[PDB]
Amino acid sequence: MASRLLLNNGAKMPILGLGTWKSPPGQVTEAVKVAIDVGYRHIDCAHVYQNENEVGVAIQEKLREQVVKREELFIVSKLWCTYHEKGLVKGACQKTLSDLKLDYLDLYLIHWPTGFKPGKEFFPLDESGNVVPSDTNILDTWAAMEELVDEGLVKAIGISNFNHLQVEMILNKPGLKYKPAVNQIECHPYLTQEKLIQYCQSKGIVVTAYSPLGSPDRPWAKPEDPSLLEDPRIKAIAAKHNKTTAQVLIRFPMQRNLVVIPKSVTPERIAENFKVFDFELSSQDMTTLLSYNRNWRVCALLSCTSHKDYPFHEEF
Ligand SMILES: NC(=O)c1ccc[n+]([C@@H]2O[C@H](COP(=O)([O-])OP(=O)(O)OC[C@H]3O[C@@H](n4cnc5c(N)ncnc54)[C@H](OP(=O)(O)O)[C@@H]3O)[C@@H](O)[C@H]2O)c1
Ligand SMILES: Cc1ccc(C(=O)c2ccc(CC(=O)O)n2C)cc1
């Protein structure tokens, strides 16, 4: 299978990338160095992860050492919710660039459709605990992203956690300049996303699947939660192919024409997660994995459920 797919800005995106959410700042530099050494060309980052400086240290070292060329890397980041105001977008992007030590991003995503009140707090709360919204709508934030493209700061722009109506809102924006190149959404056998994926792909929007392993390190994990990596049905499929369960879970979205971004700080797993290009899941395997859908979410953005733009009320 090809290592990259074509986006609608004319650029190629590596279908496998390294996730950084929850990667401790003390381990993430090594994690990214190892990833690049073992063949990863695509790194998924966010300002809200508060690790971008350390990730940047890794990228910069690998560039300086000429292990890789900048043009061979695909570096993605995301605009946090407290930055949706038009006057804050450029600055947010520039802070991310400075931390990553880059002069451009290959892809910059609106992290969530929900804008929040600007300030130091990433999740500003009222006295009663609800998130305080921004009055900036998704379409104006989109115009600000487009400006980032026209200023040379980012090669492509996209969205994340947009439901199909919100994607539709962007595609229908009056005077729309650039279409979203990507929608990055949670996807795995317990949330299969057939509808949203089909819609985006029908529009020429590439989908990136996050939490492909079910995010076993998520802070809110509970024992009664389903566990992909421990699912004996999935372990049986892996066993049949002489691969690991994680490898199956990574190959799964690839064969759906999705980009996938498993996260690890463990060097051995970083390497293991990358050799997915040497085997194929059967159509039967694929349909079987799809049959496991429970509509179960790792990231439900639970503090935002009353936000006018909360993505997950809608079926898809
Ligand atoms: N746009 C968004 O809103 C959004 C939301 C969530 C995630 N994301 C992106 O998607 C990335 C991946 O999602 P995620 O971090 O939620 O979780 P994930 O990639 O599904 O799972 C990461 C967890 O799996 C473990 N793991 C990795 N490889 C393994 C293997 N081969 N065998 C066993 N365990 C393995 C990791 O452990 P170690 O790290 O200890 O090895 C870590 O605890 C994130 O890092 C982030 O970049 C984006
Ligand atoms: C209670 C609470 C509130 C907010 C967070 C939080 O900041 C959060 C939730 C999901 C994610 C991953 C992503 O959006 O990429 N983050 C970074 C976590 C926990």
Swiss-Prot record:
One of its GO terms (biological process) is C21-steroid hormone biosynthetic process. The keyword Acetylation applies. GO terms for cellular component: cytosol; extracellular exosome; extracellular space; mitochondrion; nucleoplasm. NADP(+) binds at residues 10-19, 211-273. Changing Y49F: Complete loss of glyceraldehyde oxidoreductase activity. Substrate binds at H111. Keywords: Acetylation, Cytoplasm, Lipid metabolism, NADP, Oxidoreductase, Phosphoprotein. InterPro entries: AKR, Aldo/ket_reductase_CS, NADP_OxRdtase_dom, NADP_OxRdtase_dom_sf. The modification N6-acetyllysine is found at K95, K222, K263. Cys-299 may regulate the kinetic and inhibition properties of the enzyme, but does not participate in catalysis. Tolrestat inhibits retinal reduction. Its EC number is 1.1.1.21, 1.1.1.300, 1.1.1.372, 1.1.1.54. One of its GO terms (molecular function) is L-glucuronate reductase activity. It comes from the Eukaryota. It holds the Pfam family Aldo_ket_red. Highly expressed in embryonic epithelial cells (EUE) in response to osmotic stress. CDD domains: AKR_AKR1B1-19 (cd19107). The record marks K78 as: Lowers pKa of active site Tyr. It catalyses: an alditol + NADP(+) = an aldose + NADPH + H(+); all-trans-retinol + NADP(+) = all-trans-retinal + NADPH + H(+); 9-cis-retinol + NADP(+) = 9-cis-retinal + NADPH + H(+); 13-cis-retinol + NADP(+) = 13-cis-retinal + NADPH + H(+). Monomer. Catalyzes the NADPH-dependent reduction of a wide variety of carbonyl-containing compounds to their corresponding alcohols. Displays enzymatic activity towards endogenous metabolites such as aromatic and aliphatic aldehydes, ketones, monosacharides, bile acids and xenobiotics substrates. Key enzyme in the polyol pathway, catalyzes reduction of glucose to sorbitol during hyperglycemia. Reduces steroids and their derivatives and prostaglandins. Displays low enzymatic activity toward all-trans-retinal, 9-cis-retinal, and 13-cis-retinal. This is Aldo-keto reductase family 1 member B1. It comes from Homo sapiens (Human). The gene is AKR1B1.
